[model samples]
Target: SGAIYVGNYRVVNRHLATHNDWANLVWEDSSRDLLVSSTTAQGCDTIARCDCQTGVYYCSSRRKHYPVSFSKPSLIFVEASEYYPARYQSHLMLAVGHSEPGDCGGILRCQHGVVGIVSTGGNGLVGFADVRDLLWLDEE
Candidate 1:
């Protein structure tokens, strides 16, 4: 596994998902301490931190705090959180998802505001969420 920098969080979206199959979060190799996204609701981004073994997350967003209680393959369901803290330029870490058959993927929500994160996938789909945010921890 790769190690993360001083940033807070990281998110891994799928490279391909189309149609109903694409209507969920994707899978990626992210450290437990990763953030969600760069673009937030009017800059009111959220942040969270967690221990993969303990399966607990401590989050805060929009000046509010959210203590998440969930297992793997769960939902965060928040406007924002400390989890998945790294944000990036759209063209930098983004791609349109599709299937093996070369089918078209459909619109998938950010797994309900990326409220929660699990070991693998979520929202009753495979590990293939291509759209998301992340946690970027900086000394600044």
Candidate 2:
């Protein structure tokens, strides 16, 4: 088995019984659903990390169940930065505003790629787990 991380949010991966493809993860496509953290729920799935130094969508899922809307609240970002090896530890960066419980592990995105994963934050701030490591993961 192998593990993926976005700060404290973690998910273990193993091979599917019949193929080389890893099982139990999300395949992201922005045209469809908005990205979210694996830690969003017990059975929640995660897509690959975001593309660095690119644009993104800061999204939020408000309310519970299938309520007023199926869409996530979002803030478009053409400029997002990462504070690596500094505050909130080396693996993360201060990127956006306050977050909620389910916000952890949510996908951080750029205009065209993955950026990072939501880690944790509050008090008018939030952090993201770096996805540069995810690039290396694919090379392995």
Candidate 3:
């Protein structure tokens, strides 16, 4: 009898939903530690990073929340807590907050080569079309 083996594969946007996919990949390591990466958008740019395993999506260092606002593109910086001592080590998290009451906010999660967006109020669409060279992260 022959044994069949499956190989690792890369997932693209076509295979997943257009928005709010969160983390693109989730895997556990030999040490029982889990790592996940996802694409996020803010203003006109996209940022990606490892999703917080605890707390609100964007709120505090221990419970970080992706910044959202109607002003200029929000900067996405990683936390510097015991769980994530490496601040800004990975991609940033950006989001466009509500423009007005009942107006939806744009939430983006991104990392590496992927990006995703979500409408908090479902009334407005989060845009992720512009890519500024200044916002680009250097190769690690």
Best by lDDT: 2
* Candidate models: Cα lDDT each: 0.26, 0.38, 0.26
Candidate 1, 67-134: lDDT as tens digits: 32223332322222233443321212112221121111222223233233222222321222222234
lDDT of 3 by residue, 8-65 (tens): 2222222122243234543212111112224342122224443332111222112334
lDDT of 2 by residue, 1-140 (tens): 12344332343211111122223333322221112223342432234453344334343643221111111222223122241222223355554464654555455554434445555455655555555444433321
Off by over 4 Å in 2: 1-54, 61-88
| Candidates, ranked, TM-score | 2, 3, 1
RMSD of 3: 15.2
RMSD per prediction, one decimal? 15.4, 13.0, 15.2
Residue pairs in clash, model 2 = 37-105, 37-106, 50-114, 50-115, 51-113, 51-114, 51-115, 55-110, 55-111, 56-109
Better of 1 and 2 by TM-score: 2
C-alpha lDDT (0 to 100) for residue 137 of candidate 2 = 33
- Cα TM-score per model: 0.21, 0.41, 0.21
- The most accurate candidate by TM-score is 2
